[PDB]
Every structure is written in structure tokens, then in C-alpha cells.
DNA sequence: CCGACGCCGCATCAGC
DNA sequence: GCTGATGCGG
DNA sequence: GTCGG
């Protein structure tokens, strides 16, 4: 964390552009800068040194010189003082409340935790649970807990059908010592790109995990994606573990490698890797890598038998999960 | 200068 | 009910 | 906000 100050500043500026400005390319540009800088192995001494890094331009170079000189950025100190931006920024911390709803709420005079609690009736279901577990979701998860959760999820899934396979991805799979939540990839022989030979596949699982009281709430749910909440069982007399976010994603067993690549991330690594795909004339999603015809129209799925195969196509050497934390 | 900027599932709305 | 646009978070 | 072209 050589340049933690700079990257925090950029992160806050990113958050501002997303939540208040609703300027999603500014959001992403700052996030990119922040990530590149974050990986850089020297304590930055100037804007010009930063500006040697792809993603950092003049505007960010200026901001970094202002920061390294004073320890602050006047532009941030301002936004912090703006009640509206401050309120929009806070409200967006609730899962389900984006920039739009946030601006909505602040417009009706809803702009604090207390205001939200007294107005549950004005929140959709997702927003309701985000609020319910607000504090809980702020907490991080130590790996040792992720290892316990992993154990419960996996064995409960074997109890449903021995042919289910479940791979924990996200930061956990990247070897992080703490995760902000749990991401589960789920595959079953009876579900491939060529057929859905069984319905309920995901439901069957969410139910088992509900039966055993692991999963406690649901934010959203369709045939292949479940978004909700879970909680480790706590021993006799011990205070309960916090409530955690969980995501479960069912994908075609034959498309696992693109899936496992996708859900491992990081989000920024995926944006970076996919953009270099377009530059190299391919397109990648959670299901396939496919070539881009002269027109820009995608072609048929290329054969993939490994995470490595995917890197090959777009001429990148293989990067371990642990080295994908961007 | 210019246009592009990763790509997708589910919830909710508008319009028919 | 459907279908598409939009929000929201992955 | 940045960068390839
Ligand atoms: N949720 C999962 C997880 C794994 N597999 C599969 C496809 C693979 O070919 C294989 C791999 O076994 P591993 O558990 O060791 O997972 P890896 O993908 O890392 O191994 P490999 O790259 O050798 O396939 O089992 C699957 O179908 N669904
Ligand atoms: N804009 C995004 C956000 C997320 N993801 C992906 C890659 C991620 O790694 C995964 C999980 O999303 P998370 O928000 O859970 O991110 P992480 O697991 O990487 O981090 P955290 O430790 O906070 O959970 O899905 C993505 O493709 N694009
Ligand atoms: Cl923008
Ligand atoms: Cl500051
Ligand atoms: Cl796993
Ligand atoms: Cl596809
Ligand atoms: Cl690794
Ligand atoms: Mn995660
Ligand atoms: Mn998170
Ligand atoms: Mn997640
Ligand atoms: Mn709780
Ligand atoms: Mn571009
Ligand atoms: Mn240029
Ligand atoms: Na640069
Ligand atoms: Na939010």
C-alpha cells in the first residue's frame, strides 16, 4: 500500500462520478487509474511519474500533485461539504439503492439511515434487505469464515445431487485473506449450452441451503442467478456471526472455464481483459470467447478446454487468480 | 480532435 | 400478458 | 477522464 493516499482519493472521486454525476465512464476511468497506481511498486513522488502509467492523464496528474503537496484535494473537500452529494453518496451504500433512487430519496427529504428506516414502505424488496443488513454488509469476511461457509455450501449441494459441482470464486478464489462476500459457481451435468434437461436446478439448491438455515434472505432470483444473504451457525452461547451477502450462479457445465474466468474477476481485471479482447478481435463473456467479423458481429464459440486457452487467443500470458486482483 | 470505453441476470416500469 | 428501456449490481 | 488513431 505504497500509494494508499492517492488511490483512496481517486476511489472517492470515482464514487462521486458514479453516484452523483451518473457519469459511468468517469467512474471507470478513475477506477482504472486507481488500479494501475495500486499495482505500481514505487511510492509516487509526482504527477508526471504517475502520468507515465496507462490510465493516468493530465487531470489525474494534476490531482496527484495537489495531493502529494497538501495531503488533500480541494475538490473532494468540497463535495464532502455538499449535503446533497453527501446524502446521495451515503444512500447508495444500501444494496438496491443506486444513484437514481438515491437522488429520488434525497429529493423527498429521505437522506439518513433513520429516514430510510421510517420509510421502509417506500423501498422495494431488495432495498428493504439491504437496509435490514446494512451494518452487517459493511463488515468483511475473514478467510477462515469463508472456508467454513465453503464447507456448508458444498456439502449441502452434494446432499441435493451428487453431480452438482460448486466452485467458490470471487476474491476467495483469488486467495484474498478477507472477502466482502461469497461467490459460488454451480454446474450440473443436466444443464449445458445444448440443453436444459432439468428445471429447478438452482432452486433445488437455494432450498436445501434454506432448509438448513444457511441462506436467510433473498435479494433476487431467476433460473440461473441467485442473489441473497447467508449466515454461519454459531455455537452454544457465542454471539452470532454477521449476515453475509452471497451470490450463486448456475452455468452450463460445458462453459465452466469461461464462467470460472468471469466470476473470479476482479471486476477491473475483467474489464481490462475483455477490452484487450476487442483490441485483438475477439469478444468474451461468461459463456464464450468468440471472434469479431469484419463488421463487428460476433462469430461462433471457439473451443476452450482451460482458463489458459482463453488467455492464449488474445495473446496474454497466463495470470494466476491471485494475480488478477485489479 | 473523436469515438469507444466489458458484458450480462433479474426487478421494475411503460406502453400495447 | 408481452416486450423493450432502465436501474442496479454481478 | 484517457488513449489510440
Ligand atoms: N463447478 C465446477 C467445477 C469444476 N468442474 C469441472 C470441469 C473441469 O474440467 C474439472 C476440473 O476440476 P477442478 O476441481 O480441479 O477445477 P479446475 O477447473 O481448476 O481444474 P481443471 O482446470 O484441470 O479443469 O471439473 C465443473 O464441471 N463444474
Ligand atoms: N462490474 C463487475 C463486478 C463484478 N464482476 C465479477 C467478477 C468478480 O470477482 C465477481 C464477484 O463480484 P464481487 O463484487 O463479489 O467482487 P469480488 O468477489 O472480486 O470482491 P469482494 O471481495 O468485495 O467480494 O463477479 C464483474 O465481472 N463485473
Ligand atoms: Cl461518463
Ligand atoms: Cl482529500
Ligand atoms: Cl471451491
Ligand atoms: Cl455467448
Ligand atoms: Cl492463484
Ligand atoms: Mn465477492
Ligand atoms: Mn463487494
Ligand atoms: Mn459477490
Ligand atoms: Mn445480523
Ligand atoms: Mn477505448
Ligand atoms: Mn493520444
Ligand atoms: Na499515462
Ligand atoms: Na447501492
Does A267 contact strand C, using a CB cutoff of 7 Å?
yes
Mutational pocket test of ligand 1: of A162, A163, A167, A190, the residue with most ligand atoms within 8 Å of the beta carbon: A167
User: Is A83-139 the same fold as A4-82?
Assistant: yes
Tell me the angle at which helices A201-211 and A143-160 cross, rounded to the nearest 10 degrees.
Answer: 120
Q: Is the CB of A82 under 6 A from ligand 2?
A: no
Q: Give the CATH fold of the A4-82 domain.
A: DNA polymerase; domain 1 (1.10.150)
Does A95 contact strand C, using a CB cutoff of 7 Å?
yes
Nucleotide nearest to A126 (CA to C1'): B11
Write the secondary structure of A130-195 as one string of H (helix), E (strand) and C (coil).
Answer: HHHCHHHHHCCEEHHHHHHHHHHHHHHHHHHCCCCEEEECHHHHCCCCEECCEEEEEECCCECCCC
Q: Quick check: A276 and A211 in contact, CB under 8 A? A: no
The 3-state DSSP composition of chain A as helix, strand, coil percent (nearest 5) reads 50, 15, 35
Tell me if the domain spanning A83-139 has CATH number 1.10.150.20. Answer: yes
The CA-based diameter of chain A, rounded to the nearest angstrom, is 66
**Could you give the dihedral angle defined by the CA atoms of residues A126, A127, A133 and A139, in that order, rounded to the nearest 10 degrees?**
100
Which residue, among A180, A179, A178, A199, has the nearest Cα to A188 in the 3D structure?
A199
Rounded Cα distance between A40 and A53, Å, is 9
N- to C-terminal Cα distance for chain A? Answer: 13
Domain A140-262: homologous superfamily in CATH: Beta Polymerase, domain 2 (3.30.460.10)
| Protein-to-nucleotide distance from the CA of A288 to the C1' of C1, whole angstroms | 33
Q: What residues contact A116, with CB distance under 8 A and at least 6 apart?
A: A91, A94, A105, A110, A123, A131
Quick one: residue A255, left, alpha or beta (phi over 0 = left, psi -120 to 50 = alpha)? Answer: alpha
Output the nine-digit C-alpha cell for A63: 490531482
Out of A32, A63, A111, A253, the active site residue is A63
Listed resolution, Å: 2.1
For chain A, which residues make up each domain, given as ranges? 4-82, 83-139, 140-262, 263-325
CA-A167 nearest atom, ligand 1: 1
Solving technique: X-ray
Tell me if the domain spanning A263-325 has CATH number 3.30.70.1380. Answer: no
Q: Is the CB of A165 under 6 A from ligand 1?
A: yes
Three-state secondary structure call for residue A246 = strand
Pairing mode, if any, of strands A182-187 and A225-230? unpaired
Is A26 marked active-site?
no
Expressed in angstroms and rounded, the spacing between residue A190 Cα and the centre of ligand 15 is: 35
Amino acid at each position: 500500500t505504497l500509494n494508499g493516499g492517492i488511490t483512496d482519493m481517486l476511489t472517492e472521486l470515482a464514487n462521486f462520478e458514479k453516484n452523483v454525476s451518473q457519469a459511468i465512464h468517469k467512474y471507470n476511468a478513475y477506477r482504472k487509474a486507481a488500479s494501475v497506481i495500486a499495482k505500481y511498486p514505487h511510492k509516487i513522488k509526482s504527477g508526471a511519474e504517475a502520468k507515465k502509467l496507462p490510465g493516468v492523464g493530465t487531470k489525474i496528474a494534476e490531482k496527484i500533485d495537489e495531493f502529494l503537496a497538501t495531503g488533500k484535494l480541494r475538490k473532494l473537500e468540497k463535495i464532502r461539504q455538499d449535503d446533497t452529494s453527501s446524502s446521495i453518496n451515503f444512500l447508495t451504500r444500501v444494496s438496491g439503492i443506486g444513484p437514481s433512487a438515491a437522488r429520488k430519496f434525497v429529493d423527498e427529504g429521505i437522506k439518513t439511515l433513520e429516514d430510510l428506516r421510517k420509510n421502509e414502505d417506500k423501498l422495494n424488496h431488495h432495498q428493504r434487505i439491504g437496509l435490514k443488513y446494512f451494518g452487517d454488509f459493511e463488515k468483511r469476511i475473514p478467510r477462515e469464515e469463508m472456508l467454513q461457509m465453503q464447507d456448508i455450501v458444498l456439502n449441502e449441494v452434494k446432499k441435493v445431487d451428487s453431480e452438482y459441482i460448486a466452485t467458490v470464486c470471487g476474491s476467495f478464489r483469488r486467495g484474498a485473506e478477507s472477502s466482502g462476500d461469497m461467490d459460488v459457481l454451480l454446474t450440473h451435468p443436466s444443464f449445458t449450452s445444448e440443453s436444459t434437461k432439468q428445471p429447478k436446478l438452482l432452486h433445488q439448491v437455494v432450498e436445501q441451503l434454506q432448509k438448513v438455515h444457511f441462506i436467510t434472505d433473498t435479494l433476487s432470483k431467476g433460473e440461473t442467478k441467485f442473489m441473497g444473504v447467508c449466515q454461519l451457525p454459531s455455537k452454544n452461547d457465542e454471539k452470532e456471526y454477521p449476515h453475509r451477502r452471497i451470490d450463486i450462479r448456475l452455468i452450463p457445465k460445458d462453459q465452466y472455464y469461461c464462467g470460472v474466468l468471469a466470476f473470479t474477476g476482479s471486476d477491473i481485471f475483467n474489464k481490462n481483459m475483455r477490452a484487450h479482447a476487442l483490441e485483438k478481435g475477439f469478444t468474451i463473456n461468461e459463456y464464450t470467447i468468440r471472434p469479431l467479423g469484419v463488421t463487428g458481429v460476433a462469430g461462433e464459440p471457439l473451443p476452450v478446454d482451460s482458463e489458459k486457452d482463453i488467455f492464449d487467443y488474445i495473446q496474454w500470458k497466463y495470470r494466476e487468480p491471485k494475480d488478477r486482483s485489479e
